[PDB]
Amino acid sequence: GVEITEGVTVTAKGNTEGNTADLAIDGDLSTYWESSNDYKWIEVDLGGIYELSKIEIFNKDEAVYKYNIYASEDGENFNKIAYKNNDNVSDSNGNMHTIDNVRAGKIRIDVVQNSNSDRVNIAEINVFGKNTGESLPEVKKIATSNFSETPWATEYEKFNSDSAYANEKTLNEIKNLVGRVIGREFKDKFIFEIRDQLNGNDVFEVSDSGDGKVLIKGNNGVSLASGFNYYLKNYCNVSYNPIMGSNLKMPETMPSVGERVVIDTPYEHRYALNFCTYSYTMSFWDWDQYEEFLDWCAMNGVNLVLDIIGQEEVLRRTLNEFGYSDEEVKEFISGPAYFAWFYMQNMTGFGGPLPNDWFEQRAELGRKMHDRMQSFGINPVLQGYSGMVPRDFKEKNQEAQTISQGGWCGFDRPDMLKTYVNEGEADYFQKVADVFYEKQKEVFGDVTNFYGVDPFHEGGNTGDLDNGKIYEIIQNKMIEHDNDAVWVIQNWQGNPSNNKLEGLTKKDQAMVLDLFSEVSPDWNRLEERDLPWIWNMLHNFGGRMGMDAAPEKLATEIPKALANSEHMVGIGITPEAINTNPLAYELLFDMAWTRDQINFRTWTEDYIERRYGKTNKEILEAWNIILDTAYKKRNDYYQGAAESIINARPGFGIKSASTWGHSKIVYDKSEFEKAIEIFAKNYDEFKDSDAFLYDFADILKQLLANSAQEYYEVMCNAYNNGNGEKFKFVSGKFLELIKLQERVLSTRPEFLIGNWIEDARTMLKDSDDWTKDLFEFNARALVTTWGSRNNADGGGLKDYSNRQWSGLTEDYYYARWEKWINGLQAELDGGAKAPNIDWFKMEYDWVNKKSDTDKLYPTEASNENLGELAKIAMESYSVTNMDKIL
Numbered sequence: 001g002v003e004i005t006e007g008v009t010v011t012a013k014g015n016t017e018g019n020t021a022d023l024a025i026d027g028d029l030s031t032y033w034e035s036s037n038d039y040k041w042i043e044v045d046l047g048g049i050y051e052l053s054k055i056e057i058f059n060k061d062e063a064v065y066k067y068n069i070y071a072s073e074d075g076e077n078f079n080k081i082a083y084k085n086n087d088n089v090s091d092s093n094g095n096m097h098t099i100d101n102v103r104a105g106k107i108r109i110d111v112v113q114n115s116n117s118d119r120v121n122i123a124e125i126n127v128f129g130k131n132t133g134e135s136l137p138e139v140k141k142i143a144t145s146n147f148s149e150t151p152w153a154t155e156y157e158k159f160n161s162d163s164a165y166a167n168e169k170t171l172n173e174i175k176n177l178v179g180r181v182i183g184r185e186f187k188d189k190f191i192f193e194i195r196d197q198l199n200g201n202d203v204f205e206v207s208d209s210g211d212g213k214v215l216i217k218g219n220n221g222v223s224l225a226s227g228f229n230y231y232l233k234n235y236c237n238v239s240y241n242p243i244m245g246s247n248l249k250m251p252e253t254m255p256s257v258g259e260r261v262v263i264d265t266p267y268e269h270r271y272a273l274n275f276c277t278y279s280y281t282m283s284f285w286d287w288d289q290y291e292e293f294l295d296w297c298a299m300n301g302v303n304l305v306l307d308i309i310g311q312e313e314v315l316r317r318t319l320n321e322f323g324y325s326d327e328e329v330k331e332f333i334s335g336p337a338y339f340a341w342f343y344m345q346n347m348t349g350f351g352g353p354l355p356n357d358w359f360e361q362r363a364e365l366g367r368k369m370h371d372r373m374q375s376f377g378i379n380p381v382l383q384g385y386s387g388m389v390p391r392d393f394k395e396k397n398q399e400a401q402t403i404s405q406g407g408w409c410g411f412d413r414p415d416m417l418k419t420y421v422n423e424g425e426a427d428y429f430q431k432v433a434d435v436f437y438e439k440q441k442e443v444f445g446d447v448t449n450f451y452g453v454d455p456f457h458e459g460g461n462t463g464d465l466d467n468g469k470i471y472e473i474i475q476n477k478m479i480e481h482d483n484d485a486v487w488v489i490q491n492w493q494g495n496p497s498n499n500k501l502e503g504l505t506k507k508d509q510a511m512v513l514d515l516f517s518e519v520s521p522d523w524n525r526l527e528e529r530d531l532p533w534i535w536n537m538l539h540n541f542g543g544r545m546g547m548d549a550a551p552e553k554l555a556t557e558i559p560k561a562l563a564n565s566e567h568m569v570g571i572g573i574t575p576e577a578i579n580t581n582p583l584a585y586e587l588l589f590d591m592a593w594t595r596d597q598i599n600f601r602t603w604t605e606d607y608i609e610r611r612y613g614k615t616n617k618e619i620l621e622a623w624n625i626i627l628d629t630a631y632k633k634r635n636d637y638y639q640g641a642a643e644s645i646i647n648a649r650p651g652f653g654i655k656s657a658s659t660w661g662h663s664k665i666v667y668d669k670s671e672f673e674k675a676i677e678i679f680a681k682n683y684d685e686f687k688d689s690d691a692f693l694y695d696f697a698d699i700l701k702q703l704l705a706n707s708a709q710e711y712y713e714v715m716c717n718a719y720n721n722g723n724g725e726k727f728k729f730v731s732g733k734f735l736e737l738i739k740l741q742e743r744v745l746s747t748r749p750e751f752l753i754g755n756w757i758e759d760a761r762t763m764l765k766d767s768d769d770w771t772k773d774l775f776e777f778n779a780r781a782l783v784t785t786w787g788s789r790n791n792a793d794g795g796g797l798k799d800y801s802n803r804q805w806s807g808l809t810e811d812y813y814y815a816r817w818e819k820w821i822n823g824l825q826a827e828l829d830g831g832a833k834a835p836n837i838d839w840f841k842m843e844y845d846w847v848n849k850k851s852d853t854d855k856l857y858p859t860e861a862s863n864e865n866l867g868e869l870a871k872i873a874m875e876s877y878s879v880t881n882m883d884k885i886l
């Protein structure tokens, strides 16, 4: 005591009809606030700062509720003070929570579970405490620096105007790169020189200096870093990949080059990144991870990179001009795990609101990146504007003309401004486009001529408008703000249609990314229309894991496309996540530096020697097996690596884990297992190579995914034939298999759920508990249910981003399979028929758990012996010995 009965108000960001926020604080148990969307929290202002001692919560019924309570004494930071996570039903007595005399002027109550409904509620909330006599300070307004006002602008302009400074900056940066990649001790073993292009092409040179140093030339930063990489790979037997395992062990003396090499690339651009990568992979990256990635990029020839960092600040400044407060902008924009589909105009709000801190920190990160990109000569692809507005845009701008875009996977798509209007109508596409392109300049300055925008990505509605005219107007508007602009357009499943593309009146100033060239190429239509285009390897969908690559097609189809075209201006990668199969990515970027087809088999032979730091007859034999099975050329249509049954929602007749995925293994399983047998045999000798360990884990987890599929088919039979004892046995072996798999995945830092989650919670500095918890929600949601019920179930996104990860496997995948198996066992044993399992309910239970109150997942890999784990896999859980195993 005492109860705070006066001066208290409340807000929410959604409610069902008649069940408003104020009903949570009206003294009446019969009236309640109820959620209508994914904002399941209310915010109570107490009319002053109180030292709280008790908080009391009533719900509308006797369901089981779970919620977290946060408080703020400064109006900015909301920190967790209480929570209910027990399985006790609500009742007429309410729930009483003791607070450790915490100072608070505001409270947030986030109800994350209701056993009875998707919708949550608070019938009453009573707060008890002692009045401090103080009031909350004013909340600082979001303010960011203008680019021209920062040291970043001075540096950017200096590099631009002063050739000697620019060259000195580039050359120092490439030396810094060497020291980051292989160690500071190797920096002074290199001499870097800028030279000209070779007949209009990017080019590098590597040769001996005459005093035991390596002299490397390049026309620019990425040419210089590519020469460095070339030297490492071809002379040092070193392989750098910061995301998927390296061999960075340098020779004792620096190897001599011998005959000087001069290597050019016929491609103007080497492209990297899908909008999706910024979500499935990069959601929670700090500068350290970005710097690392850019070093890998420059070393791999990359000079064109999609860039959406800090674009929330750009949109904020733009919408602020058209009737939106900062809070309204924050409700529009998604959370940090969803920017891919926000910027692709597919969804809004979900995972947010972002903290106020977000905007400055991210504008600064993007500025940091444009400085490094400028040094290397990497062109960022910034944002174009196509007409994306919130659904309430007309409400705030009555003369605006908009086209309703409908739903995408159960999310409301933003509206789209009519790209043109009738005479006598206000043209808000022109108004908003002008502001956007101006504000983007204000935030980042003039850093690129490349702008990406993709109207009608995976649906939408063109309304009454002409398709070609829409694309003419978007491009003309883009060129109005940058005369040299190039509109970078994604080509996905025949869209944009030929009619849309024929609307581009300046073909030179558009560039189409053929997104899926290694499985389903579609560049002929672009070539025929004289559109500049880029051949792209997609490879990875949703970050879904498994042994999968197309090295033969990369080694042959790329130079074949160069010979058979006149408008192929580059190659690149467009993966939805960068987390899988390093072979595919090294080969792809290697193919930029040849005009001739190469032998993928002998390419692989050399690749594995530098990756492992050594090779032998048996290891080569194992990789040829991988090339003959998992990496064998195929001519069908498929999206990503074949999915593991372990990761699928349990049921009968499963043929995938995700809606658009596949579980069909097109190679011989027993043959593939021979590769694991060879790796186990050579473990003790190759165990000093981390990349070897990485690859061993990759193929071994693939072995167990494959055999789980077969064991699942057997236990399905044992159930259908009514054999309860046989089902018990095979289902037991199935579960023991998953447990072995969890041990295998525990060995790699990159397979830990705990790193993904901790990165989310630590990505910004000085985050309150509210922000950490929300960002953990984003991390957990994306790799499981994706969205909430209507997104996961009706919308088809359930387990789209499924990961063969440690922690996630034990607590989520195993748990699903265990529950289904038990219900089937109970029925077989003469019990009641197996119940329907509301899978989403169980999954979203895991999604909403917090690292600080529930279970903290480790950030440290285990010491398990892959060689031994492989022997146990071969003996007890294989396809080869399946008949003996039973």
Ligand SMILES: [Ca+2]
Pocket: 023, 024, 025, 026, 027, 028, 029, 030, 031, 032, 033, 122, 123, 124
């Ligand atoms: Ca009430």
